[PDB]
Coordinates of C-alpha atoms in Angstrom, one line a residue:
Chain Y
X1 CA 0.0 0.0 0.0
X2 CA 1.4 3.3 -1.1
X3 CA 0.5 6.9 0.0
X4 CA -2.6 6.7 -2.3
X5 CA -4.4 4.7 0.4
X6 CA -4.2 7.6 2.9
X7 CA -5.0 11.3 2.9
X8 CA -4.9 14.3 5.3
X9 CA -1.8 13.1 7.2
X10 CA 0.9 15.2 5.6
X11 CA 2.1 16.3 9.0
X12 CA 2.5 12.7 10.2
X13 CA 4.5 11.6 7.1
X14 CA 6.6 14.8 7.1
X15 CA 7.4 14.3 10.8
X16 CA 7.9 10.5 10.3
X17 CA 10.4 10.8 7.4
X18 CA 13.1 11.8 9.9
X19 CA 11.9 9.4 12.7
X20 CA 11.9 6.4 10.3
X21 CA 13.0 7.3 6.8
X22 CA 16.1 9.2 7.9
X23 CA 18.5 6.2 8.1
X24 CA 17.1 4.8 4.9
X25 CA 18.5 6.9 2.1
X26 CA 21.8 7.8 3.8
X27 CA 22.7 5.5 6.8
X28 CA 26.2 7.0 7.0
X29 CA 25.1 9.9 9.2
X30 CA 24.7 7.5 12.1
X31 CA 28.4 8.0 12.9
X32 CA 28.9 11.7 12.2
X33 CA 25.6 13.1 13.7
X34 CA 25.7 10.7 16.6
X35 CA 21.9 10.3 16.6
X36 CA 20.4 7.7 18.9
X37 CA 19.0 4.5 17.6
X38 CA 15.4 5.0 16.4
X39 CA 13.6 2.7 18.7
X40 CA 10.3 2.7 16.8
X41 CA 7.6 5.3 17.1
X42 CA 4.3 5.3 19.0
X43 CA 1.0 7.2 18.6
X44 CA -2.0 7.9 20.8
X45 CA -5.6 8.9 20.0
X46 CA -8.5 7.1 18.4
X47 CA -7.3 5.8 15.0
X48 CA -9.9 6.5 12.4
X49 CA -7.8 5.4 9.4
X50 CA -4.0 4.9 9.2
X51 CA -3.3 2.5 12.1
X52 CA -1.9 -0.2 9.8
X53 CA -1.4 1.7 6.5
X54 CA 1.2 3.9 8.3
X55 CA 3.6 1.0 9.0
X56 CA 2.5 -0.6 5.8
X57 CA 2.9 2.6 3.7
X58 CA 6.2 3.6 5.2
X59 CA 7.4 0.0 5.2
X60 CA 6.1 -0.2 1.6
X61 CA 8.0 2.9 0.6
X62 CA 11.1 1.4 2.4
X63 CA 10.8 -1.8 0.3
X64 CA 11.2 -3.9 3.5
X65 CA 9.2 -6.8 4.9
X66 CA 6.2 -6.5 7.2
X67 CA 6.5 -9.2 9.9
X68 CA 3.7 -9.7 12.5
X69 CA 4.1 -11.2 16.0
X70 CA 0.4 -12.1 16.3
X71 CA 8.6 -22.0 24.3
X72 CA 8.8 -18.2 24.3
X73 CA 8.0 -18.2 20.5
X74 CA 9.6 -14.8 19.9
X75 CA 13.2 -15.7 19.3
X76 CA 12.5 -17.2 15.8
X77 CA 10.9 -13.9 14.7
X78 CA 14.2 -12.2 15.7
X79 CA 16.1 -14.9 13.8
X80 CA 14.0 -14.1 10.7
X81 CA 14.6 -10.4 11.6
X82 CA 18.4 -11.3 11.5
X83 CA 18.5 -13.2 8.2
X84 CA 16.3 -10.4 6.8
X85 CA 18.2 -7.2 7.7
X86 CA 15.1 -4.9 7.5
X87 CA 11.8 -5.6 9.4
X88 CA 8.8 -3.7 10.6
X89 CA 6.7 -5.1 13.5
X90 CA 3.1 -4.2 14.1
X91 CA 0.2 -5.7 16.0
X92 CA -3.6 -5.8 15.4
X93 CA -6.7 -7.6 16.7
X94 CA -6.4 -5.5 19.9
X95 CA -8.2 -2.4 18.4
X96 CA -11.5 -3.3 20.0
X97 CA -13.9 -2.0 22.7
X98 CA -12.0 -4.0 25.4
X99 CA -9.2 -1.3 25.5
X100 CA -11.2 0.8 28.0
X101 CA -10.7 -0.9 31.5
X102 CA -6.9 -0.9 31.2
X103 CA -6.8 -4.3 32.9
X104 CA -6.8 -6.5 29.8
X105 CA -5.0 -3.8 27.8
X106 CA -2.4 -3.4 30.6
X107 CA -1.9 -7.1 31.0
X108 CA -2.3 -8.4 27.5
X109 CA -0.4 -5.3 26.2
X110 CA 2.1 -5.6 29.1
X111 CA 3.1 -9.0 27.8
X112 CA 4.0 -7.5 24.4
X113 CA 5.7 -4.7 26.4
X114 CA 8.0 -7.3 27.9
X115 CA 8.5 -8.9 24.5
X116 CA 9.6 -5.6 23.0
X117 CA 11.7 -4.9 26.1
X118 CA 13.7 -8.1 25.6
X119 CA 13.8 -7.6 21.8
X120 CA 14.8 -3.9 22.2
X121 CA 17.3 -5.0 24.8
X122 CA 18.8 -7.3 22.1
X123 CA 18.9 -4.2 19.8
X124 CA 20.5 -2.4 22.7
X125 CA 22.8 -5.4 23.2
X126 CA 24.0 -5.7 19.6
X127 CA 23.3 -4.1 16.2
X128 CA 23.8 -7.1 13.8
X129 CA 20.4 -6.5 12.4
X130 CA 19.7 -2.8 12.1
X131 CA 16.5 -1.1 11.2
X132 CA 14.1 -2.9 13.5
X133 CA 11.1 -0.9 14.4
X134 CA 7.8 -1.3 16.4
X135 CA 4.7 0.8 16.4
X136 CA 2.0 0.8 19.2
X137 CA -1.2 2.7 19.0
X138 CA -4.4 1.0 20.1
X139 CA -7.1 3.6 21.0
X140 CA -6.1 5.9 23.8
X141 CA -3.7 6.8 26.7
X142 CA -3.1 3.0 27.2
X143 CA -0.2 3.6 24.8
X144 CA 1.0 6.2 27.3
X145 CA 0.8 3.4 29.9
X146 CA 3.0 1.4 27.6
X147 CA 5.2 4.6 27.9
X148 CA 4.8 4.2 31.6
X149 CA 6.4 0.8 31.2
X150 CA 9.0 2.4 28.8
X151 CA 9.9 5.9 30.2
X152 CA 12.4 8.5 28.9
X153 CA 13.7 6.4 26.0
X154 CA 14.3 7.3 22.4
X155 CA 10.7 6.5 21.4
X156 CA 8.8 9.2 19.7
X157 CA 5.5 10.8 20.6
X158 CA 3.1 11.6 17.7
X159 CA -0.6 12.5 18.2
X160 CA -3.4 12.0 15.6
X161 CA -5.8 14.9 15.7
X162 CA -8.8 14.6 13.3
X163 CA -9.7 18.3 12.8
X164 CA -13.2 17.8 11.4
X165 CA -14.1 14.6 9.5
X166 CA -11.1 15.1 7.3
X167 CA -9.9 11.7 8.3
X168 CA -13.3 10.1 7.6
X169 CA -14.8 11.5 4.5
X170 CA -12.0 11.5 1.9
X171 CA -10.6 8.3 3.4
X172 CA -14.1 6.8 3.2
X173 CA -14.0 7.7 -0.5
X174 CA -10.5 6.2 -0.9
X175 CA -11.4 3.0 1.1
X176 CA -14.9 2.9 -0.6
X177 CA -14.2 3.5 -4.3
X178 CA -13.8 -0.2 -4.8
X179 CA -17.5 -0.7 -4.5
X180 CA -20.4 1.8 -5.1
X181 CA -21.0 4.7 -2.7
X182 CA -23.4 7.6 -2.4
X183 CA -22.3 11.2 -2.8
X184 CA -24.0 13.1 0.0
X185 CA -23.3 10.7 2.8
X186 CA -23.9 12.4 6.2
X187 CA -21.0 11.2 8.4
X188 CA -21.5 13.8 11.1
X189 CA -23.7 11.8 13.5
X190 CA -22.9 8.3 12.2
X191 CA -19.1 9.0 12.4
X192 CA -18.8 11.3 15.4
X193 CA -21.3 9.3 17.5
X194 CA -18.7 6.5 17.9
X195 CA -15.6 8.2 19.6
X196 CA -13.1 7.0 22.2
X197 CA -12.9 3.3 23.0
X198 CA -13.4 2.1 19.4
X199 CA -12.0 3.8 16.3
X200 CA -11.7 0.7 14.1
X201 CA -15.4 0.1 14.4
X202 CA -15.9 2.7 11.7
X203 CA -14.3 0.3 9.2
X204 CA -16.1 -2.5 11.0
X205 CA -19.3 -0.7 10.1
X206 CA -17.9 -0.3 6.5
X207 CA -17.2 -4.0 5.9
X208 CA -20.0 -5.4 8.1
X209 CA -22.4 -2.9 6.4
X210 CA -21.1 -4.1 3.1
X211 CA -22.2 -7.6 4.2
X212 CA -25.7 -6.2 4.4
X213 CA -25.2 -4.5 1.1
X214 CA -24.6 -8.0 -0.3
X215 CA -27.3 -9.9 1.5
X216 CA -29.8 -7.0 1.2
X217 CA -29.2 -6.7 -2.6
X218 CA -28.1 -3.1 -2.2
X219 CA -25.9 -2.1 -5.1
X220 CA -24.6 1.0 -3.3
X221 CA -24.0 2.1 0.3
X222 CA -26.7 4.1 2.0
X223 CA -27.0 5.9 5.4
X224 CA -29.4 3.4 7.0
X225 CA -27.0 0.6 6.2
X226 CA -24.3 2.3 8.3
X227 CA -27.0 3.2 10.8
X228 CA -28.1 -0.4 11.1
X229 CA -24.5 -1.7 11.2
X230 CA -23.7 0.6 14.1
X231 CA -26.4 -1.0 16.1
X232 CA -25.4 -4.5 14.9
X233 CA -21.9 -3.9 16.2
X234 CA -23.2 -2.2 19.3
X235 CA -25.1 -5.3 20.4
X236 CA -21.7 -7.1 20.9
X237 CA -19.6 -4.0 21.7
Chain D
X1 CA -30.0 -17.1 12.9
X2 CA -26.7 -16.1 11.4
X3 CA -24.9 -19.5 11.0
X4 CA -27.2 -20.7 8.2
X5 CA -27.2 -17.2 6.8
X6 CA -23.4 -17.0 6.5
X7 CA -23.2 -20.6 5.3
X8 CA -26.0 -19.7 2.9
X9 CA -24.1 -16.8 1.4
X10 CA -20.6 -18.0 1.4
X11 CA -21.6 -21.6 0.6
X12 CA -24.8 -22.0 -1.4
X13 CA -25.8 -18.6 -2.6
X14 CA -23.8 -18.6 -5.9
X15 CA -25.6 -21.6 -7.5
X16 CA -23.5 -22.2 -10.6
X17 CA -22.8 -18.4 -10.7
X18 CA -19.1 -18.7 -11.2
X19 CA -18.7 -15.1 -12.3
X20 CA -20.7 -13.6 -9.4
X21 CA -17.7 -13.8 -7.0
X22 CA -15.6 -12.6 -10.0
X23 CA -17.5 -9.3 -10.4
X24 CA -18.9 -8.5 -6.9
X25 CA -17.3 -5.4 -5.4
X26 CA -16.6 -6.7 -1.9
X27 CA -14.0 -9.5 -2.0
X28 CA -15.8 -12.8 -1.2
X29 CA -14.2 -14.8 1.6
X30 CA -13.5 -18.6 1.2
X31 CA -13.2 -19.9 4.8
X32 CA -16.0 -20.2 7.3
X33 CA -15.0 -21.2 10.9
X34 CA -17.4 -22.9 13.3
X35 CA -16.8 -23.6 16.9
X36 CA -18.5 -24.7 20.2
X37 CA -17.4 -27.4 22.5
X38 CA -20.9 -28.5 23.8
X39 CA -22.4 -28.9 20.3
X40 CA -20.7 -31.7 18.4
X41 CA -22.1 -31.1 14.9
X42 CA -19.6 -31.6 12.1
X43 CA -22.0 -34.2 10.6
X44 CA -25.5 -32.8 10.7
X45 CA -24.5 -29.7 8.7
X46 CA -22.2 -31.6 6.3
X47 CA -24.9 -34.1 5.5
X48 CA -27.6 -31.5 5.6
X49 CA -25.9 -29.2 3.0
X50 CA -24.7 -32.4 1.3
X51 CA -28.3 -33.5 0.7
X52 CA -30.2 -30.2 0.3
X53 CA -28.3 -28.8 -2.7
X54 CA -27.8 -31.0 -5.8
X55 CA -24.0 -30.9 -6.2
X56 CA -20.8 -32.9 -5.4
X57 CA -19.6 -33.4 -1.8
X58 CA -16.2 -34.9 -1.1
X59 CA -15.3 -34.7 2.6
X60 CA -11.9 -35.5 4.1
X61 CA -10.8 -37.6 7.0
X62 CA -9.0 -35.9 9.9
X63 CA -6.3 -38.5 10.4
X64 CA -4.1 -39.1 7.4
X65 CA -1.0 -37.0 8.4
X66 CA 1.0 -39.6 10.3
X67 CA 3.0 -40.4 7.2
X68 CA 4.0 -36.7 6.6
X69 CA 4.0 -35.5 10.2
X70 CA 1.1 -33.0 10.0
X71 CA 2.2 -31.9 6.6
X72 CA -0.1 -34.0 4.5
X73 CA -3.1 -32.0 5.6
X74 CA -2.8 -28.9 3.4
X75 CA -1.7 -31.1 0.5
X76 CA -4.8 -33.3 0.7
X77 CA -7.2 -30.5 1.3
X78 CA -5.4 -28.5 -1.4
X79 CA -5.9 -31.4 -3.8
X80 CA -9.5 -31.4 -2.9
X81 CA -9.5 -27.6 -3.5
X82 CA -8.1 -28.0 -7.0
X83 CA -10.3 -30.9 -8.0
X84 CA -13.3 -29.1 -6.6
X85 CA -12.6 -25.8 -8.4
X86 CA -11.7 -27.8 -11.6
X87 CA -14.7 -30.1 -11.3
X88 CA -18.4 -29.1 -10.8
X89 CA -19.1 -26.6 -8.0
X90 CA -18.7 -28.6 -4.7
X91 CA -18.5 -27.9 -1.0
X92 CA -15.6 -29.1 1.2
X93 CA -15.7 -29.7 5.0
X94 CA -12.7 -29.7 7.2
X95 CA -12.7 -31.6 10.5
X96 CA -10.2 -32.2 13.4
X97 CA -7.2 -30.2 12.4
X98 CA -6.3 -29.4 16.0
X99 CA -3.6 -32.1 15.9
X100 CA -2.0 -30.6 12.8
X101 CA -2.5 -27.0 14.0
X102 CA 0.2 -27.5 16.7
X103 CA -12.3 -13.8 -6.6
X104 CA -12.3 -17.4 -5.4
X105 CA -14.5 -20.3 -6.5
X106 CA -13.9 -22.7 -3.6
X107 CA -16.1 -23.3 -0.5
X108 CA -14.3 -24.0 2.8
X109 CA -16.3 -24.7 6.0
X110 CA -14.4 -25.5 9.1
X111 CA -15.9 -26.9 12.4
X112 CA -13.9 -28.0 15.5
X113 CA -14.0 -27.9 19.3
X114 CA -10.5 -26.6 20.3
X115 CA -9.2 -23.1 19.7
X116 CA -6.3 -23.1 22.1
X117 CA -3.8 -25.0 20.0
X118 CA -4.8 -23.2 16.8
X119 CA -2.0 -21.2 15.3
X120 CA -2.9 -17.6 14.4
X121 CA -1.3 -18.1 11.0
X122 CA -4.4 -19.9 9.7
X123 CA -6.8 -17.7 11.7
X124 CA -5.4 -14.6 10.0
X125 CA -8.1 -12.6 8.2
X126 CA -8.7 -12.6 4.5
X127 CA -9.3 -16.4 4.4
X128 CA -11.1 -17.1 7.7
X129 CA -12.9 -13.8 7.9
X130 CA -15.9 -15.3 9.7
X131 CA -15.8 -17.2 13.0
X132 CA -19.2 -18.5 13.8
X133 CA -19.9 -19.8 17.4
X134 CA -22.2 -22.8 17.5
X135 CA -23.3 -23.7 21.0
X136 CA -25.3 -26.8 22.0
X137 CA -28.7 -26.9 20.3
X138 CA -31.2 -24.9 22.5
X139 CA -35.0 -25.4 22.7
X140 CA -35.5 -23.8 19.3
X141 CA -32.8 -25.9 17.7
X142 CA -34.2 -29.0 19.4
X143 CA -37.7 -28.3 18.1
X144 CA -36.2 -27.9 14.6
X145 CA -33.7 -30.8 15.0
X146 CA -36.6 -33.0 16.2
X147 CA -39.1 -31.8 13.6
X148 CA -36.6 -32.4 10.8
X149 CA -36.3 -36.0 11.9
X150 CA -39.9 -36.8 12.9
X151 CA -41.2 -35.3 9.7
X152 CA -40.2 -38.4 7.9
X153 CA -40.6 -41.0 10.7
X154 CA -43.8 -42.1 12.5
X155 CA -45.6 -40.1 15.2
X156 CA -48.8 -40.0 17.0
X157 CA -50.9 -37.4 19.0
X158 CA -50.0 -39.2 22.2
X159 CA -46.3 -38.4 21.7
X160 CA -45.8 -34.9 23.2
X161 CA -42.8 -32.7 22.4
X162 CA -42.9 -30.6 25.6
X163 CA -41.0 -33.3 27.6
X164 CA -38.9 -33.9 24.5
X165 CA -37.9 -30.2 24.5
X166 CA -37.7 -29.9 28.3
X167 CA -35.7 -33.0 29.1
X168 CA -33.1 -32.8 26.3
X169 CA -32.5 -29.3 27.4
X170 CA -31.8 -30.6 30.9
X171 CA -29.4 -33.4 29.8
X172 CA -26.8 -31.4 28.0
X173 CA -25.4 -34.0 25.7
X174 CA -24.0 -34.3 22.2
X175 CA -25.2 -35.9 18.9
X176 CA -28.8 -36.0 20.0
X177 CA -29.7 -36.5 16.3
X178 CA -27.8 -39.8 16.3
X179 CA -29.8 -40.7 19.5
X180 CA -32.9 -40.2 17.5
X181 CA -31.5 -42.4 14.8
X182 CA -31.1 -45.0 17.5
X183 CA -34.7 -44.3 18.4
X184 CA -35.4 -45.2 14.7
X185 CA -33.3 -48.4 15.1
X186 CA -35.7 -49.2 18.0
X187 CA -38.7 -48.0 16.0
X188 CA -37.9 -50.4 13.1
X189 CA -38.5 -53.3 15.6
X190 CA -41.8 -53.8 13.8
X191 CA -43.4 -54.5 17.2
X192 CA -45.3 -51.1 16.9
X193 CA -45.9 -49.3 13.7
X194 CA -45.9 -45.9 15.6
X195 CA -43.1 -45.3 18.0
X196 CA -44.1 -44.7 21.6
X197 CA -42.4 -43.3 24.7
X198 CA -41.1 -46.7 25.6
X199 CA -38.7 -46.7 22.7
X200 CA -37.6 -43.1 23.3
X201 CA -37.0 -43.7 27.0
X202 CA -35.5 -47.2 26.3
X203 CA -33.1 -45.6 23.8
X204 CA -32.4 -42.9 26.4
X205 CA -31.5 -45.5 29.1
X206 CA -29.7 -48.1 27.0
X207 CA -27.8 -45.9 24.6
Chain C
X1 CA -52.1 -52.4 13.1
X2 CA -49.9 -50.7 15.6
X3 CA -50.7 -53.4 18.2
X4 CA -51.0 -57.2 18.2
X5 CA -54.5 -57.8 19.6
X6 CA -57.4 -57.5 17.2
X7 CA -59.6 -55.7 19.7
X8 CA -56.9 -53.1 20.2
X9 CA -56.4 -52.3 16.5
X10 CA -60.1 -52.5 15.9
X11 CA -61.0 -50.6 19.1
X12 CA -58.4 -48.0 17.9
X13 CA -60.0 -48.0 14.4
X14 CA -63.5 -47.6 15.8
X15 CA -64.7 -51.0 16.8
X16 CA -61.0 -55.6 26.5
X17 CA -59.8 -56.9 29.9
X18 CA -57.2 -59.1 28.1
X19 CA -53.6 -57.7 28.1
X20 CA -50.9 -57.7 25.3
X21 CA -47.2 -57.5 25.0
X22 CA -47.3 -53.8 25.9
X23 CA -49.5 -54.5 29.0
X24 CA -52.0 -52.0 27.6
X25 CA -55.7 -53.0 27.3
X26 CA -58.1 -51.8 24.5
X27 CA -59.2 -48.9 26.7
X28 CA -55.8 -47.1 26.2
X29 CA -56.2 -47.1 22.4
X30 CA -60.0 -46.6 22.5
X31 CA -59.5 -43.5 24.7
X32 CA -56.5 -42.6 22.5
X33 CA -58.4 -42.4 19.2
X34 CA -61.4 -40.8 21.0
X35 CA -64.2 -43.3 20.2
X36 CA -67.1 -42.5 22.6
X37 CA -69.2 -45.5 21.7
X38 CA -66.3 -47.9 22.1
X39 CA -65.1 -46.6 25.4
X40 CA -68.8 -46.5 26.6
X41 CA -69.2 -50.1 25.2
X42 CA -66.1 -51.5 26.9
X43 CA -66.8 -49.5 30.1
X44 CA -70.4 -50.6 29.7
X45 CA -69.3 -54.2 29.9
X46 CA -67.3 -53.4 33.0
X47 CA -63.6 -53.1 32.0
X48 CA -61.4 -51.7 34.7
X49 CA -60.7 -48.0 34.2
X50 CA -57.3 -47.9 35.9
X51 CA -55.5 -50.8 34.3
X52 CA -51.9 -49.7 34.8
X53 CA -49.4 -51.1 32.2
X54 CA -45.8 -52.0 32.9
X55 CA -44.9 -48.3 32.7
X56 CA -48.0 -46.9 34.4
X57 CA -49.8 -45.2 31.5
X58 CA -53.4 -44.9 32.6
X59 CA -56.1 -44.3 30.0
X60 CA -56.7 -40.8 31.4
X61 CA -53.1 -39.8 30.5
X62 CA -53.6 -40.7 26.9
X63 CA -57.3 -39.5 26.8
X64 CA -56.4 -36.1 28.3
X65 CA -53.2 -35.9 26.2
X66 CA -55.1 -36.6 23.0
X67 CA -57.4 -33.7 23.5
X68 CA -60.7 -35.7 23.6
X69 CA -63.1 -33.7 25.7
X70 CA -65.9 -36.3 25.5
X71 CA -63.5 -39.2 26.5
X72 CA -62.3 -37.1 29.5
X73 CA -66.0 -36.5 30.5
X74 CA -66.6 -40.3 30.2
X75 CA -63.6 -41.2 32.3
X76 CA -64.5 -38.6 34.9
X77 CA -68.0 -40.0 34.8
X78 CA -66.7 -43.5 35.5
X79 CA -64.4 -42.2 38.3
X80 CA -60.9 -42.3 36.8
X81 CA -57.9 -41.5 38.9
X82 CA -57.1 -37.8 38.2
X83 CA -53.6 -38.2 39.8
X84 CA -52.4 -41.5 38.5
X85 CA -48.6 -42.2 38.3
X86 CA -47.2 -43.0 34.9
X87 CA -43.7 -44.0 33.9
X88 CA -42.3 -40.5 34.6
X89 CA -44.6 -39.9 37.5
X90 CA -46.7 -37.3 35.6
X91 CA -50.4 -36.9 36.4
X92 CA -53.2 -36.6 33.8
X93 CA -53.4 -32.9 34.7
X94 CA -49.9 -32.4 33.3
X95 CA -51.1 -33.7 30.0
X96 CA -54.3 -31.7 30.3
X97 CA -52.4 -28.4 30.7
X98 CA -49.6 -29.7 28.5
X99 CA -51.5 -29.9 25.2
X100 CA -53.1 -26.5 25.9
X101 CA -56.5 -28.1 26.3
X102 CA -58.5 -25.6 28.4
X103 CA -61.6 -27.9 28.5
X104 CA -59.8 -30.9 30.0
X105 CA -58.0 -28.5 32.4
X106 CA -61.2 -27.0 33.8
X107 CA -62.8 -30.4 33.9
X108 CA -60.0 -32.3 35.6
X109 CA -59.5 -29.3 38.0
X110 CA -63.3 -29.0 38.6
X111 CA -63.2 -32.5 40.2
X112 CA -60.5 -31.7 42.7
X113 CA -57.2 -32.5 41.0
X114 CA -53.8 -31.5 42.3
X115 CA -51.8 -28.9 40.4
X116 CA -48.7 -29.1 42.6
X117 CA -48.5 -32.9 42.2
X118 CA -44.7 -33.6 42.2
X119 CA -43.9 -36.0 39.3
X120 CA -40.7 -38.0 39.0
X121 CA -39.1 -34.8 37.5
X122 CA -40.4 -32.8 40.5
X123 CA -42.1 -30.3 38.1
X124 CA -45.6 -29.2 37.2
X125 CA -47.4 -28.4 34.0
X126 CA -46.5 -24.7 34.3
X127 CA -43.0 -25.5 33.0
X128 CA -44.7 -26.9 29.9
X129 CA -47.3 -24.1 29.4
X130 CA -44.5 -21.6 30.1
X131 CA -42.2 -23.7 28.0
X132 CA -44.4 -23.2 24.9
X133 CA -45.8 -19.9 26.0
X134 CA -49.3 -20.7 27.1
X135 CA -50.4 -17.7 29.3
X136 CA -54.1 -18.6 29.4
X137 CA -53.3 -22.1 30.7
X138 CA -51.1 -20.7 33.4
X139 CA -53.7 -18.1 34.3
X140 CA -56.6 -20.7 34.5
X141 CA -54.2 -22.8 36.7
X142 CA -53.9 -19.7 38.9
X143 CA -57.7 -19.7 39.0
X144 CA -57.4 -23.0 40.9
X145 CA -54.7 -22.0 43.5
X146 CA -51.6 -23.3 41.6
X147 CA -48.0 -22.4 42.7
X148 CA -45.6 -20.5 40.5
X149 CA -42.2 -21.4 42.1
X150 CA -42.0 -25.2 41.7
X151 CA -38.3 -26.1 41.7
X152 CA -37.5 -28.5 38.9
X153 CA -34.8 -31.2 39.0
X154 CA -32.2 -28.6 38.1
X155 CA -33.7 -26.1 40.6
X156 CA -35.3 -23.7 38.1
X157 CA -38.7 -22.1 38.7
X158 CA -41.5 -21.7 36.1
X159 CA -40.4 -18.0 35.9
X160 CA -37.0 -19.2 34.8
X161 CA -38.5 -21.3 32.0
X162 CA -40.9 -18.4 31.1
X163 CA -38.0 -16.0 30.8
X164 CA -35.9 -18.6 28.9
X165 CA -38.6 -18.6 26.1
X166 CA -38.3 -14.8 25.9
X167 CA -42.0 -14.4 26.9
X168 CA -41.7 -10.9 28.2
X169 CA -45.5 -10.7 28.8
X170 CA -45.4 -13.9 30.9
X171 CA -42.2 -12.7 32.6
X172 CA -43.5 -9.3 33.8
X173 CA -46.9 -10.7 34.4
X174 CA -45.7 -13.6 36.6
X175 CA -43.5 -11.0 38.3
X176 CA -46.7 -8.9 38.8
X177 CA -48.6 -12.0 40.1
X178 CA -46.5 -13.3 43.0
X179 CA -43.5 -15.2 41.4
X180 CA -40.4 -14.7 43.5
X181 CA -37.4 -13.4 41.5
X182 CA -35.1 -14.2 44.4
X183 CA -35.2 -18.0 44.3
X184 CA -31.8 -19.3 43.2
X185 CA -31.2 -22.5 41.2
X186 CA -28.1 -24.7 41.0
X187 CA -26.8 -22.4 38.2
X188 CA -27.1 -19.5 40.8
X189 CA -28.8 -17.4 38.1
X190 CA -31.7 -15.0 38.7
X191 CA -34.9 -15.0 36.5
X192 CA -33.8 -11.5 35.2
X193 CA -30.4 -12.8 34.1
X194 CA -31.8 -15.7 32.1
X195 CA -34.0 -13.3 30.1
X196 CA -32.5 -10.9 27.5

C-alpha cells in the first residue's frame, strides 16, 4: 500500500520521514551526527484510518518486509529479523472495545511490552540486524501506559488529531471507491457518535455494512446501512 | 439465525454463478470457521448441506497426516481444492485439524471444538474472515432438529414434544440426532408401527 | 395395526380386559383415538378404568393428552384416577395443561385434582405451558390455586422457563402475580439474568 491509500496526514509523514525514513537513504550519518538508535515510534488517539497503513505505507516505501508477531515463540521472529536485515513489527486484533478498562489492555499489552523490552534489549545489546522498528497505538492513553512501562527512552510521541471529518470523508472515498458509494453521505452523527474506545469500528461498520449490502441486494452504500450496522456492532460491543 | 445465513451466502448462494464472485465489489471470503465445545455437529451440517443442494460433496478424514508429520493435511485438502474448483461446484468440509494445528471459487467450511492449539497463522483474516460460534442446540434448535427428523418418521398425537424439548435441554449431551437415529433403530423393531415413549426412554436409558 | 391384539387395533380404528405385550388394554387405544361409543361399550361391559401397564400409563393420561373432551368426560363420569402415576410420575393434569386443552384442564380441575403434584421430575405443567408460552393455561391454573415457584430437578422455577422462552409478557406478568425473582437455582442465576 502506497501513499494513495491515505489522505490528510501530511504532518505525520513529514514528521515521520526523519523518525523512520532518515537512516534509509543515507545511513552513513549514524556516525557523524551521533543520533540515537530510532527505537520505533508510538501514537496515541482514536485511530480512524491509518493505524496499519502507516507502518505498511512507510514499510512499503522502504521496500522492506512486514512481519507480525500475532517456548517463548519470539526468538524465531528475531532470527528471521536477523537473516532479513530490515523488518517492521506491528500488531492488530487489539483495536476493539476491550481497551477501556486498562486491565486487559495493561496485562495483554504488558506481555507485548515485555516482548519488545527483551527484543529492544537485544537491539541495545548488539546491532547485527539494524532497522528494527515497532509501532504501538491502540485507542487511547493506554499507549501512554506502555510509555509508563517504557519511560524516557528514544521512542517518539506523535498525536493523531482529526480536525473535522477530514480523516473520515476523503478516506471513506479512498477506502470505498472499490464498490459503489453515495455522494451526499452524512457522516456527522454516524461518524462522530462512535468516539473513544473504538476507532476501528468505523471500518467495521464499513465492511459489516457491506455484508448487508450483499445480502440485502443493495448495489450502493446508503446511510441506513451504516446506521443499522452501528447497532449491529453495538449489540456485541 | 446467522450461521445458516453465513453458510447460505458463502456456501450455497452462488448456485453455478461462477462469475458472481468474480464481479462483486466486496471481496468474497472462502473460509468459514465454526466452533462450540458442547455442540458436536460436524456431521448434521455436512450431510444437511450435502443433501439439500444438488452438487458434489467430497469430505476429508481428519487423520491421514502420520506419514507426513502433520504436513499431508494442506496437501490433501489442497488437492480437494483444485479438483473441486476444476470439477463441478462442490463444497468441502474440514474436521479435526487441532492435531496438525500445533475472486475465489472454492467453499471452505471448518468446524472444530478446540481453539487453544490453533496457530494464528491460519486464523489470520482474508481467508477465515468469519468465526461463527455454534453452542449446543437450544430449545428452538431442538424443536427444529426433532421436527426435521420426525417429519419423515412415525408419530402420534400421544407423543408430546414438551417433555422432549424440556428433558433434552436438561441433559446437556452431544449428537442427539444420532440418538434419535437409534430411536429409529428401535422403532424399526416392527413391534409397533408408531413409535411410543417406551422406545424413546428405552433408547435414552440403554444408549 | 400398531398393536398385536385384534380388539386393540379395531378398538383403535373404531370397533377388553385381556392384556398384550405392551401390557395395555383396549381402553388405552380406544381412549387414544377418541371413540365415545367404544369406550362406553367397553366400560359398559365393566372393563377396569385404571389398568396400569408396565410403565404406568393410565387411559386418562392418553385421553387427556389426546385432547378428547368427551372421553375425559366419560372417564370422569366413571371415576378415573385424576392423579395416576405413569412411567415418569406425571399426572393426567400435566397432559391436560400440557396440550393447551383448556376444557380438559377446567374439567379435571373441577373435580379436585392436584396442580402441585410432584412428578418424577419434581415439576408441574407450568414449566410446559410456560415452555411453549401458554399464558391462558397458566392463568386458569392460577384460578385453581396453583403455585408458580415449583423447583425442577435442576432447581429452576416456572419463571426461569418463562424468561428462557423470551416471553416478556409472561415474565413481567408472573412478576406482577407473585412469582419470586429471588429463588436461586443450581446455576445460581436469577430470573432476570436468564432473560435478554
